[PDB]
mmCIF file of C-alpha atoms in Angstrom:
data_model
loop_
_atom_site.group_PDB
_atom_site.id
_atom_site.type_symbol
_atom_site.label_atom_id
_atom_site.label_comp_id
_atom_site.label_asym_id
_atom_site.label_seq_id
_atom_site.Cartn_x
_atom_site.Cartn_y
_atom_site.Cartn_z
ATOM 1 C CA UNK A 1 56.489 -31.889 -49.116
ATOM 2 C CA UNK A 2 56.668 -28.165 -48.427
ATOM 3 C CA UNK A 3 58.021 -26.632 -45.199
ATOM 4 C CA UNK A 4 58.074 -28.526 -41.887
ATOM 5 C CA UNK A 5 54.620 -27.195 -40.941
ATOM 6 C CA UNK A 6 52.974 -29.786 -43.228
ATOM 7 C CA UNK A 7 54.152 -33.050 -41.678
ATOM 8 C CA UNK A 8 52.019 -35.902 -43.011
ATOM 9 C CA UNK A 9 52.278 -39.623 -42.278
ATOM 10 C CA UNK A 10 51.364 -42.468 -44.639
ATOM 11 C CA UNK A 11 50.882 -46.004 -43.319
ATOM 12 C CA UNK A 12 51.374 -49.261 -45.228
ATOM 13 C CA UNK A 13 50.528 -52.598 -43.601
ATOM 14 C CA UNK A 14 52.408 -55.823 -44.331
ATOM 15 C CA UNK A 15 50.848 -59.137 -43.347
ATOM 16 C CA UNK A 16 52.937 -61.421 -41.115
ATOM 17 C CA UNK A 17 54.490 -64.534 -42.576
ATOM 18 C CA UNK A 18 53.304 -64.765 -46.185
ATOM 19 C CA UNK A 19 51.578 -61.679 -47.575
ATOM 20 C CA UNK A 20 50.238 -63.619 -50.575
ATOM 21 C CA UNK A 21 48.400 -66.224 -48.477
ATOM 22 C CA UNK A 22 44.773 -66.745 -49.479
ATOM 23 C CA UNK A 23 43.585 -66.276 -45.881
ATOM 24 C CA UNK A 24 44.152 -62.518 -46.089
ATOM 25 C CA UNK A 25 41.637 -60.244 -47.807
ATOM 26 C CA UNK A 26 43.101 -58.254 -50.687
ATOM 27 C CA UNK A 27 43.438 -54.497 -50.187
ATOM 28 C CA UNK A 28 42.358 -52.424 -53.172
ATOM 29 C CA UNK A 29 44.637 -49.505 -53.978
ATOM 30 C CA UNK A 30 43.527 -45.921 -53.448
ATOM 31 C CA UNK A 31 41.473 -44.632 -56.369
ATOM 32 C CA UNK A 32 42.891 -41.141 -55.706
ATOM 33 C CA UNK A 33 46.604 -41.622 -54.957
ATOM 34 C CA UNK A 34 47.543 -45.221 -55.729
ATOM 35 C CA UNK A 35 48.324 -46.730 -52.327
ATOM 36 C CA UNK A 36 46.837 -49.769 -50.572
ATOM 37 C CA UNK A 37 44.113 -49.228 -48.003
ATOM 38 C CA UNK A 38 44.498 -50.334 -44.397
ATOM 39 C CA UNK A 39 42.004 -53.181 -44.040
ATOM 40 C CA UNK A 40 40.504 -54.225 -40.707
ATOM 41 C CA UNK A 41 37.951 -57.038 -40.907
ATOM 42 C CA UNK A 42 35.252 -56.722 -38.265
ATOM 43 C CA UNK A 43 33.316 -59.576 -36.643
ATOM 44 C CA UNK A 44 30.362 -57.749 -35.143
ATOM 45 C CA UNK A 45 28.066 -59.259 -32.519
ATOM 46 C CA UNK A 46 24.400 -58.280 -32.481
ATOM 47 C CA UNK A 47 22.851 -59.813 -29.328
ATOM 48 C CA UNK A 48 22.817 -57.996 -25.997
ATOM 49 C CA UNK A 49 21.262 -59.169 -22.722
ATOM 50 C CA UNK B 1 27.703 -59.192 -39.255
ATOM 51 C CA UNK B 2 31.051 -58.688 -41.037
ATOM 52 C CA UNK B 3 32.077 -55.241 -42.296
ATOM 53 C CA UNK B 4 35.136 -54.487 -44.423
ATOM 54 C CA UNK B 5 36.779 -51.453 -42.799
ATOM 55 C CA UNK B 6 39.311 -49.719 -45.061
ATOM 56 C CA UNK B 7 41.182 -46.752 -43.607
ATOM 57 C CA UNK B 8 43.052 -44.488 -45.997
ATOM 58 C CA UNK B 9 46.870 -44.543 -45.832
ATOM 59 C CA UNK B 10 47.401 -40.778 -46.052
ATOM 60 C CA UNK B 11 47.149 -38.909 -42.761
ATOM 61 C CA UNK B 12 43.791 -37.408 -41.845
ATOM 62 C CA UNK B 13 45.261 -34.184 -40.417
ATOM 63 C CA UNK B 14 48.729 -32.696 -40.759
ATOM 64 C CA UNK B 15 50.845 -33.928 -37.847
ATOM 65 C CA UNK B 16 50.024 -31.344 -35.141
ATOM 66 C CA UNK B 17 53.185 -31.606 -33.031
ATOM 67 C CA UNK B 18 55.018 -28.600 -31.630
ATOM 68 C CA UNK B 19 58.692 -28.332 -32.527
ATOM 69 C CA UNK B 20 59.548 -28.297 -28.822
ATOM 70 C CA UNK B 21 57.387 -31.348 -28.104
ATOM 71 C CA UNK B 22 58.827 -33.073 -31.178
ATOM 72 C CA UNK B 23 62.286 -32.366 -29.756
ATOM 73 C CA UNK B 24 61.030 -33.902 -26.511
ATOM 74 C CA UNK B 25 60.011 -36.981 -28.515
ATOM 75 C CA UNK B 26 63.435 -37.096 -30.163
ATOM 76 C CA UNK B 27 65.375 -36.827 -26.903
ATOM 77 C CA UNK B 28 63.067 -39.298 -25.145
ATOM 78 C CA UNK B 29 63.742 -41.800 -27.953
ATOM 79 C CA UNK B 30 67.499 -41.225 -27.542
ATOM 80 C CA UNK B 31 67.994 -42.780 -24.090
ATOM 81 C CA UNK B 32 67.521 -46.094 -22.289
ATOM 82 C CA UNK B 33 63.953 -44.994 -21.487
ATOM 83 C CA UNK B 34 61.494 -47.308 -23.234
ATOM 84 C CA UNK B 35 58.314 -45.891 -24.774
ATOM 85 C CA UNK B 36 55.464 -47.738 -26.472
ATOM 86 C CA UNK B 37 53.869 -47.181 -29.847
ATOM 87 C CA UNK B 38 50.130 -46.561 -29.544
ATOM 88 C CA UNK B 39 47.677 -48.326 -31.868
ATOM 89 C CA UNK B 40 44.139 -47.200 -31.018
ATOM 90 C CA UNK B 41 41.147 -48.325 -33.075
ATOM 91 C CA UNK B 42 37.677 -47.280 -31.903
ATOM 92 C CA UNK B 43 34.425 -48.847 -33.103
ATOM 93 C CA UNK B 44 31.461 -46.558 -32.403
ATOM 94 C CA UNK B 45 27.928 -47.918 -32.670
ATOM 95 C CA UNK B 46 24.895 -45.870 -33.714
ATOM 96 C CA UNK B 47 22.703 -44.772 -30.842
ATOM 97 C CA UNK B 48 20.099 -47.244 -29.611
ATOM 98 C CA UNK B 49 17.098 -45.733 -27.787
ATOM 99 C CA UNK C 1 14.224 -23.421 -19.544
ATOM 100 C CA UNK C 2 14.956 -21.702 -22.884
ATOM 101 C CA UNK C 3 18.502 -20.631 -23.772
ATOM 102 C CA UNK C 4 19.491 -18.577 -26.814
ATOM 103 C CA UNK C 5 22.505 -20.370 -28.314
ATOM 104 C CA UNK C 6 24.457 -18.225 -30.788
ATOM 105 C CA UNK C 7 27.423 -19.848 -32.522
ATOM 106 C CA UNK C 8 29.881 -17.595 -34.313
ATOM 107 C CA UNK C 9 29.979 -17.797 -38.128
ATOM 108 C CA UNK C 10 33.769 -17.775 -38.502
ATOM 109 C CA UNK C 11 35.453 -21.154 -38.143
ATOM 110 C CA UNK C 12 36.765 -22.108 -34.715
ATOM 111 C CA UNK C 13 39.971 -23.714 -36.035
ATOM 112 C CA UNK C 14 41.619 -23.484 -39.438
ATOM 113 C CA UNK C 15 40.329 -26.351 -41.579
ATOM 114 C CA UNK C 16 42.734 -29.175 -40.628
ATOM 115 C CA UNK C 17 42.499 -31.305 -43.780
ATOM 116 C CA UNK C 18 45.504 -32.877 -45.470
ATOM 117 C CA UNK C 19 45.971 -32.034 -49.138
ATOM 118 C CA UNK C 20 45.852 -35.746 -49.958
ATOM 119 C CA UNK C 21 42.680 -36.282 -47.923
ATOM 120 C CA UNK C 22 41.176 -33.142 -49.460
ATOM 121 C CA UNK C 23 41.956 -34.634 -52.875
ATOM 122 C CA UNK C 24 40.204 -37.783 -51.657
ATOM 123 C CA UNK C 25 37.191 -35.616 -50.787
ATOM 124 C CA UNK C 26 37.304 -34.002 -54.226
ATOM 125 C CA UNK C 27 37.488 -37.291 -56.125
ATOM 126 C CA UNK C 28 34.836 -38.898 -53.911
ATOM 127 C CA UNK C 29 32.511 -35.976 -54.715
ATOM 128 C CA UNK C 30 33.222 -36.454 -58.439
ATOM 129 C CA UNK C 31 31.513 -39.828 -58.971
ATOM 130 C CA UNK C 32 28.097 -41.454 -58.622
ATOM 131 C CA UNK C 33 29.003 -42.270 -55.005
ATOM 132 C CA UNK C 34 26.678 -40.383 -52.661
ATOM 133 C CA UNK C 35 28.040 -38.882 -49.438
ATOM 134 C CA UNK C 36 26.162 -37.064 -46.683
ATOM 135 C CA UNK C 37 26.822 -33.703 -45.094
ATOM 136 C CA UNK C 38 27.269 -33.998 -41.331
ATOM 137 C CA UNK C 39 25.525 -31.562 -38.974
ATOM 138 C CA UNK C 40 26.458 -32.429 -35.386
ATOM 139 C CA UNK C 41 25.313 -30.287 -32.461
ATOM 140 C CA UNK C 42 26.153 -31.471 -28.940
ATOM 141 C CA UNK C 43 24.513 -30.160 -25.767
ATOM 142 C CA UNK C 44 26.638 -30.943 -22.703
ATOM 143 C CA UNK C 45 25.145 -30.570 -19.233
ATOM 144 C CA UNK C 46 27.116 -29.597 -16.128
ATOM 145 C CA UNK C 47 27.973 -32.497 -13.865
ATOM 146 C CA UNK C 48 25.334 -33.574 -11.357
ATOM 147 C CA UNK C 49 26.624 -35.439 -8.280
#
């Protein structure tokens, strides 16, 4: 953007193989800029010994 | 037990790298020396008494 | 056993927020979505062997 002091990095994730496969969960675009979110599905365990 | 985590694509903070250390990055990535990209994702639980 | 803790009013570091993420803050605080202010105070003890 402006001078080199304002380095900013934007990340876009592409699914391996086929991106349009139904197994993936669709990423809604940013409501503020218009870019896809980075989605990480979590499988959380609840039991502890 | 499944949470949809959606990180934003735009960087959280401006890239805080010194010009000298960025030059170190550049010259390290310009030799036979092999360096690894770092992908760190941290899940932090709420405190349990 | 009572210590008078006195934080300075002026910010410790310049606010390190990207313009895009600050715009995300602005547009998140411009909808019915409710977000919470964070007040984190951490007391760290010296190491005990």
